[PDB]
Amino acid sequence: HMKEIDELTIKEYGVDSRILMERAGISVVLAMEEELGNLSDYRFLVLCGGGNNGGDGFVVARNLLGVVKDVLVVFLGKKKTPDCEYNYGLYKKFGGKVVEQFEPSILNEFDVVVDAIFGTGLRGEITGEYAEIINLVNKSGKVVVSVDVPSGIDSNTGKVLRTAVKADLTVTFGVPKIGHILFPGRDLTGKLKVANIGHPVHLINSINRYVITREMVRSLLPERPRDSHKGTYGKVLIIAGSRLYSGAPVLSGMGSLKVGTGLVKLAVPFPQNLIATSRFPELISVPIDTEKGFFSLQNLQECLELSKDVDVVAIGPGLGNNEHVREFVNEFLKTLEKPAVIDADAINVLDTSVLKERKSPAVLTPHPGEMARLVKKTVGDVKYNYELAEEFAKENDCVLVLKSATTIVTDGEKTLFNITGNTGLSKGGSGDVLTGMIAGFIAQGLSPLEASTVSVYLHGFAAELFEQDERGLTASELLRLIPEAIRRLK
């Protein structure tokens, strides 16, 4: 946490706590200027709690004095921490006006609300006057700037503690908090600026949960040496589809090809295999003879043979979920000595003992419905639960990619959060594409974790490049957009 980071900076490095608070407040002023333009025309209402969030707010208020049209502080706390007390004292010596009573109509006479009520010190549900003021701010239509985290967001989870401020702009200190990255918190944060307030870079860099950034993805993209051939770029087998679900294999296979993979082979029940090469003749789509249109133990030996001459196997999209599919998936994965990307129906039937016993690596790519079924919990218990995802990945020796508007990627030691993408991905097929992308990057030589990190970012970024309204995006268009995402990343 930042809490350790502040403590160490004050207590070991010897930076006065007041210097950190001064730097915090001025960052807020500079950030607002960058967003609003010249501040001198605006009237500011600063809502200060009795903690250090509020102390940061007093610094903001004091620094606007004499330079803007009007500043008023509403002090909502009871007691004040020492630094809040000190900065309150300064605000008042500088000529500032504080009131401790909030009237519904005071929003009327101001243009900007600075929300310095609660930061990382929030504990428990917000009620009483705190709640009523937050609710009035949210109904006011004013520009809202939140200091550190919008008041009411739990900064460790992104959950709303009964009510919370909806900000246009949030200025946070040092590092983003998990609460800005996970929803609903991500939504209520608005535009996020991360301010440097003087922590040693070494401490800032020691945080073990990160946002996946463009620079990180750029440095992981594999090299394309000119003297190369398709084998340079790896071979993927995708075991997918059924008589019910004939489209999934095609989207996965192209997903691998669009990220630069050299050779992609599908194993799909006949005649559904013919669908892939009618759409994309660059694919190899091997026909698998099945009794009733679904993979079963009858196909185990053929699939292991096909596996020998590839670098990675993806399994699951469109397989169906019946007992014979379950038997096949689990015996295949138990015997396969190649990295496996396990998705969709292969997750739904997976025996997790199999994962622990495997010597080769695995990535799992569940949405929360699948994760919920896999660990026998409710969707609400697993959704955005990064600590559960970490425990799962660590216990089963895998990489877990837990899909949602913010995607979590973890191997149990390191956890990354993806924030690219939009609601155009909220449509059948988009998951199938990501599976192929991950397998592809593994085939090109990236680690399972690296392959997942690059893929989730690029997959969301390709969606953002869609030229028309995002709700009309389909998986086939997403595929077309991948090579543009790649170019824009470089």
Binding site: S27, L30, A31, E34, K193, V194, A195, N196
Partner: peptide
């Protein structure tokens, strides 16, 4: 870049 990351 010195003060703010986007």
């Amino acid at each position: 870049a010195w003060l703010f990351e986007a």
